[PDB]
Design a binder for these strands. Structure first.
Ligand SMILES: [Mg+2]
Ligand SMILES: [Mg+2]
Ligand SMILES: [Mg+2]
Ligand SMILES: [Mg+2]
Ligand SMILES: [Mg+2]
Ligand SMILES: [Mg+2]
Ligand SMILES: [Mg+2]
Ligand SMILES: [Mg+2]
Ligand SMILES: [Mg+2]
Ligand SMILES: [Mg+2]
Ligand SMILES: [Mg+2]
Ligand SMILES: [Mg+2]
Ligand SMILES: [Mg+2]
Ligand SMILES: [Mg+2]
Ligand SMILES: [Mg+2]
Ligand SMILES: [Mg+2]
Ligand SMILES: [Mg+2]
Ligand SMILES: [Mg+2]
Ligand SMILES: [Mg+2]
Ligand SMILES: [Mg+2]
Ligand SMILES: [Mg+2]
Ligand SMILES: [Mg+2]
Ligand SMILES: [Mg+2]
Ligand SMILES: [Mg+2]
Ligand SMILES: [Mg+2]
Ligand SMILES: [Mg+2]
Ligand SMILES: [Mg+2]
Ligand SMILES: [Mg+2]
Ligand SMILES: [Mg+2]
Ligand SMILES: [Mg+2]
Ligand SMILES: [Mg+2]
Ligand SMILES: [Mg+2]
Ligand SMILES: [Mg+2]
Ligand SMILES: [Mg+2]
Ligand SMILES: [Mg+2]
Ligand SMILES: [Mg+2]
Ligand SMILES: [Mg+2]
Ligand SMILES: [Mg+2]
Ligand SMILES: [Mg+2]
Ligand SMILES: [Mg+2]
Ligand SMILES: [Mg+2]
Ligand SMILES: [Mg+2]
Ligand SMILES: [Mg+2]
Ligand SMILES: [Mg+2]
Ligand SMILES: [Mg+2]
Ligand SMILES: [Mg+2]
Ligand SMILES: [Mg+2]
Ligand SMILES: [Mg+2]
Ligand SMILES: [Mg+2]
Lengths: 120, 56, 209, 122, 114
RNA sequence: CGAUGUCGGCUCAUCACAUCCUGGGGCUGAAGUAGGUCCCAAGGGUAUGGCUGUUCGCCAUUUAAAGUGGUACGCGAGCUGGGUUUAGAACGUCGUGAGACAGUUCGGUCCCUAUCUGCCGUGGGCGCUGGAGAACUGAGGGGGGCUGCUCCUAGUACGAGAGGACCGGAGUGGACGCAUCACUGGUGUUCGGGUUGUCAUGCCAAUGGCACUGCCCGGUAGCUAAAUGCGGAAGAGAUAAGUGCUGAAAGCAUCUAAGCACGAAACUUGCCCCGAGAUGAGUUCUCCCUGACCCUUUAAGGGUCCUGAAGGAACGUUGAAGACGACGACGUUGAUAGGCCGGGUGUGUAAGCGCAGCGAUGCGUUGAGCUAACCGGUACUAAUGAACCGUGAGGCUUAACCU
RNA sequence: AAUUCCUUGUCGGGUAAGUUCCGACCUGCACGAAUGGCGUAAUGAUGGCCAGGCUGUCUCCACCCGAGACUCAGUGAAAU
RNA sequence: ACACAGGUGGUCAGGUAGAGAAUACCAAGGCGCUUGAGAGAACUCGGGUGAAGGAACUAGGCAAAAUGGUGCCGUAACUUC
RNA sequence: AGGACCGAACCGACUAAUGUUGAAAAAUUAGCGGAUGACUUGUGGCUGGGGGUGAAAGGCCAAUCAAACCGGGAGAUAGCU
């Protein structure tokens, strides 16, 4: 009955959740900003920010690990090469959410989640 | 399990005693662009609290 | 005598010289500060009201602040009354420490029990479950029959049915006071008390012998 | 944590080898016997020239269980199987004369002092 | 919680010698034998360690007269006079519960030596 | 009879008392222990099994006891479907036969998304006479109410002896209830590891996907029982049956007529919970509001302009609070959530490199790597002044003070 | 006894306890010889009974993963 | 009656594991099944795990759980051999 | 060799739960029987209603069958509602 329990079941099963957030940390990283529902965005921060953190240390281990999550070398290239050194000195909060209204086709609360500097 | 007597129009009324929607009263205007928006939400031109975030 | 209000810190244990593990509830008891005395004359009964802890000023209200001000004690998280008992006497602004209990020996402890939400009959009333098997159709945890027939022709009040369980006042009586340490704001009572960690507790000297 | 239908090994030269608990004595609706509680058993297996025979029905104190025993400091003593020692009906008191395997101090129980006084361990 | 630590660690032992599941330890335990307090020895294989501050505990398994006896000690209870490592055991697994399904010979665990 | 489904079981109960146990008491062909019988008493408590569809019953073993009844022989829009139980089939028995049995035997579809009442939970509204925030008082309602065994008194009273108490006290249990997660454990598809088959990331090495989480070994937080704490009370009042004091009517006797003492798990209290919608809407503390105009049938009248407090609520971050509402925390004068740091804990020595070995694989760096909901910290990220609702000093009468 | 009303017949066995089961007895209410009698290896999603293993069937339920239930948006029934 | 979890004859047979046209994973090819978004109550459905006990359930072990391959060794009564 | 054994396709339908205003006017899921034979199936043909066909249940003969369906006698008759 939830007491002190973290993590959002997003009406999916365990594997699917994992697949999706893997598939979506890669998105946010690739595009630095993506638009999603608010709940997913809020969870995304838990998957993604600890990749960033991991990337603050370049090492064959950490890259491989980074590859275990994500499983995409373009993305593990971008952390480590770009994003790790961007956020080098900032302690967490590598990401920010901007709420942005309601999805037409089903009314889902949406939000942008973006890296904290973009420029892109 | 179905009703034995047809419920009255009055009763229909009372049951809907609580489905008025509530208007929002929370719109704010962005200082730097003057478009309306919900509190803590970005504007349609992607302004939030003055700064232009987003940009699409 | 009166009682104090405190906070439920958590549980642990005190090992005793002779190899006994006493399990204890650690209750914080910061000084209680009297915010109002009441008497026959003015109220129709004798009692102190007390506050404890502290409240973000921005979250004190005008009315509250007025009241606190009067007694000249700083805002606390709340107010609680303890019935005075012919003899007992206190003054507004007086501070009362956990050492109130330095003896007493047992105490009754009241809290707001953890909240289990909408509980069905099995959990809430220890209703015993039907057959899992043997033919049962959609009726394992369901509650059984709830009445007789035409006679009543109704369900009786107080019928054990499903609904909110938890999150209500509960007293637990005559717990052994294990330790009283004012310097540390500590009351150790033996055994578990109601409520999740962090919530308010009221300790009164146990009423029963 | 012994109950009706539970099988127990015997911990004495009573001759019983496998007994089955058919009643947990000591209280209405009482469901478990453990620690050192007195159950009622039938005998499912005995040796050929023992002091008891199969199909006999008497009592027994339980002296070892998989559920074990807690102690004043929190700790636990578990056992790999459940064992008891046959006592005769209208006397409690053990039928055997020797005891096997370890037993726990809970038996301090006046009437079981014998059991502890025999018996290898603890 | 900060209070609780204060309370707990002022109640903990500062000399629990080191050991690990697989090790064979002899625990000396205070007991009242009839009229006497007196130390008493229990020796067996550590098959589990529960590491939690004052509540830390270990389960020591030992084959007494034909079948197993496991006891879980409460590392910091005054009951536990002393803990000793009679043989450094070599296993790899935190909880050695598989040894219950093992008798006499399959039960044995390599010596660590090192 | 334009349909009130049924025996037993299961689940859930609720009354009666003609009381099974526990409590009080009278008589006893009551020495004690233990009975018998009756009176009072319905507070609570009141068995698991073998056989049979069974209820019952018999049997086994418990127990303080295994109560008797009513409730559509309580309870199928609550479950079951063994019995009853259509259609198949068989035996026996009847019948020329079709067939039949209130004989037996094998097989054999149990629908219904709850409008109303009721009930369990939980909100919204308005009221409580200016409005608001609290803390209360406690009318009323609900919960609870069981009991074994051992020890002392005492091997005493009693008894020829066997045996064996009353009164009182002390322990420790059973069943039940509540709470809790500290301990012992369970689970822990969000933590770690091992491993099968296959596919992929070019290959090696290292990984990931799928196969019930592929199959497994463990396991944090939480939830939780088997886990560990607490409970039933004592006390008080008025009583039942009953035991009596004083005492006439009735010179005596008489517990009663007047007067008085006792007397039970029932009653009222005492204990826990709800509780002022207690509209008979109570009390206490604190807080906020100090402009004018017009009109009409002129009155507790309607409207306009200006005003808009206390507080509420909204929005966001949220919670051991939660179906939703609700309740609690926090919103930069900030630890509310996420992240981040350190720690713990879990797993159990990663990768990479080196050394040994033909190789599988070992050993070293290494208790390594990783590590959720945990603990201690930290404004990096998100919690924007605002909006809205609620007003602008609050009726008449009498009385007591007061000018 | 797919046959026996009385009937849970009696006795034996198995169980702590067995209206069923097995073995017996014969008092066959109301077996019996191709309306076949009595046997019978094998066969059987056939009926009855015992036992080992196995277990959440049960003591007595806990926890967890999922589809509903619940909240928002769109559509939008039914019996009566 | 439906863009309906039903029914409908024949032909083709890639890789790895495998006895196999079983089964798991893949290739080619084809698809995610025409309401979605959140919550993470009771209860229902479908699964996983479960201390001690182990048929005490029940009309009945109903349902579960369990067994499960290959090769050797080795297998009783009874029998129509 | 075999109305032989185990087991997919194929044929079937013993148990259970789900469903019961269904996804479905008989099904889904897990288990289950046969699976070289009295096997199973495509196409076309034949048998017709007191008639057929039936390894026999009163089974089947177009969602049905102790006498199909359609049209007619026909406004059968209804001392019943
Ligand atoms: Mg949390
Ligand atoms: Mg959904
Ligand atoms: Mg809660
Ligand atoms: Mg039950
Ligand atoms: Mg059904
Ligand atoms: Mg079901
Ligand atoms: Mg009525
Ligand atoms: Mg009807
Ligand atoms: Mg009476
Ligand atoms: Mg009489
Ligand atoms: Mg009835
Ligand atoms: Mg029904
Ligand atoms: Mg029948
Ligand atoms: Mg745990
Ligand atoms: Mg490789
Ligand atoms: Mg895949
Ligand atoms: Mg998977
Ligand atoms: Mg007189
Ligand atoms: Mg109250
Ligand atoms: Mg860490
Ligand atoms: Mg913290
Ligand atoms: Mg005005
Ligand atoms: Mg016979
Ligand atoms: Mg049996
Ligand atoms: Mg015949
Ligand atoms: Mg024949
Ligand atoms: Mg679920
Ligand atoms: Mg809707
Ligand atoms: Mg479709
Ligand atoms: Mg189709
Ligand atoms: Mg296949
Ligand atoms: Mg889709
Ligand atoms: Mg399982
Ligand atoms: Mg289990
Ligand atoms: Mg087990
Ligand atoms: Mg067994
Ligand atoms: Mg039974
Ligand atoms: Mg039975
Ligand atoms: Mg089965
Ligand atoms: Mg299975
Ligand atoms: Mg064949
Ligand atoms: Mg099938
Ligand atoms: Mg076959
Ligand atoms: Mg044809
Ligand atoms: Mg047909
Ligand atoms: Mg005809
Ligand atoms: Mg016609
Ligand atoms: Mg005519
Ligand atoms: Mg007509």
């Amino acid at each position: 009955m939830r007491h002190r329990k973290s993590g959002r079941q997003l009406n999916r099963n365990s594997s699917h959740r994992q697949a999706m957030f893997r598939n979506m940390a890669g998105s946010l990283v690739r595009h630095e900003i993506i638009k999603t529902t608010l709940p997913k965005a809020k969870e995304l921060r838990r998957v993604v920010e600890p990749l960033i953190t991991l990337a603050k240390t370049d090492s064959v281990a950490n890259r491989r690990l980074a590859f275990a999550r994500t499983r995409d070398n373009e993305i593990v290239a971008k952390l480590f090469n770009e994003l790790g050194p961007r956020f080098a000195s900032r302690a967490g909060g590598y990401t920010r959410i901007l709420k942005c209204g309601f999805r037409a086709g089903d009314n889902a609360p949406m939000a942008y989640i973006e890296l904290v500097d973009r420029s892109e | 399990a179905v009703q034995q007597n047809k419920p009255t129009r009055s009763k229909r009324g009372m049951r809907r005693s609580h489905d008025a929607l509530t208007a929002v009263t929370s719109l704010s205007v962005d200082k730097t662009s003057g478009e309306k928006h919900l509190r803590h939400h970005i504007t349609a031109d992607g302004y939030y609290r003055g700064r232009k975030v987003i940009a699409k | 005598m009166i009682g104090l209000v405190g906070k439920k810190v958590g549980m642990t244990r005190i090992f005793t010289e002779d190899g006994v593990s006493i399990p204890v509830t650690v209750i914080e008891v910061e000084a209680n500060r009297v915010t109002q005395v009441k008497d026959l004359a003015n109220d129709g009964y004798r009692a102190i009201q007390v506050t404890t802890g502290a409240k973000k000023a921005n979250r004190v209200t005008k009315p509250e602040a007025g009241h606190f001000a009067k007694a000249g004690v700083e805002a606390g998280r709340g107010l609680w009354e303890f019935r005075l008992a012919e003899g007992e006497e206190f003054t507004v602004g007086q501070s009362i420490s956990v050492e109130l209990f330095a003896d007493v020996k047992k105490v009754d402890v009241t809290g707001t029990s953890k909240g289990k939400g909408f509980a069905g009959t099995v959990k809430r009333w220890n209703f015993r479950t039907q057959d899992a098997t043997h033919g049962n159709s959609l009726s394992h945890r369901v509650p059984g029959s709830i009445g007789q027939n035409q006679t009543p022709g109704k369900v009786f009040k107080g019928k054990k049915m499903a609904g909110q369980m938890g999150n209500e006042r509960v007293t637990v009586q005559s717990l052994d006071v294990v330790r009283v340490d004012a310097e540390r704001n500590l009351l150790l009572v033996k055994g578990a008390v109601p409520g999740a960690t962090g919530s308010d507790l009221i300790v009164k000297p146990a009423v029963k012998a | 944590m012994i109950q009706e239908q539970t099988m127990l090994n015997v911990a004495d030269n009573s001759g019983a080898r496998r007994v089955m608990c058919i009643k947990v004595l000591g209280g209405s609706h009482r469901r478990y016997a453990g620690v050192g509680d007195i159950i009622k058993i039938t005998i499912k297996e005995a040796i050929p020239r023992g002091k008891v025979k199969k199909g006999d029905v008497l009592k027994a104190v339980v002296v070892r269980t998989k559920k074990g025993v807690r102690r004043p400091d929190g700790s636990v003593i578990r056992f790999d199987g459940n064992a008891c020692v046959l006592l005769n009906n209208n006397s409690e008191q053990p039928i055997g004369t020797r005891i096997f395997g370890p037993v726990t101090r809970e038996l301090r129980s006046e009437k079981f002092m014998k059991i502890i006084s025999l018996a290898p361990e603890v | 919680s900060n209070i609780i630590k204060q309370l707990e660690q002022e109640q903990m032992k500062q000399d629990v010698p080191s050991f690990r599941p697989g090790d064979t330890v002899e625990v000396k335990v205070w007991v009242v034998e009839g009229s006497k307090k007196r130390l008493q020895a229990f020796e067996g294989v550590v098959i589990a360690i529960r590491n939690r501050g004052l509540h830390s505990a270990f389960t020591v398994r030992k084959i007494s007269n034909g079948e197993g006896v496991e006891r879980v000690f409460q590392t910091h209870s005054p009951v536990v006079d002393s803990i000793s490592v009679k043989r450094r055991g070599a296993v790899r697994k935190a909880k050695l519960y598989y040894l219950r399904e093992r008798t006499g010979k399959a039960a044995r665990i390599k010596e660590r030596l090192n």
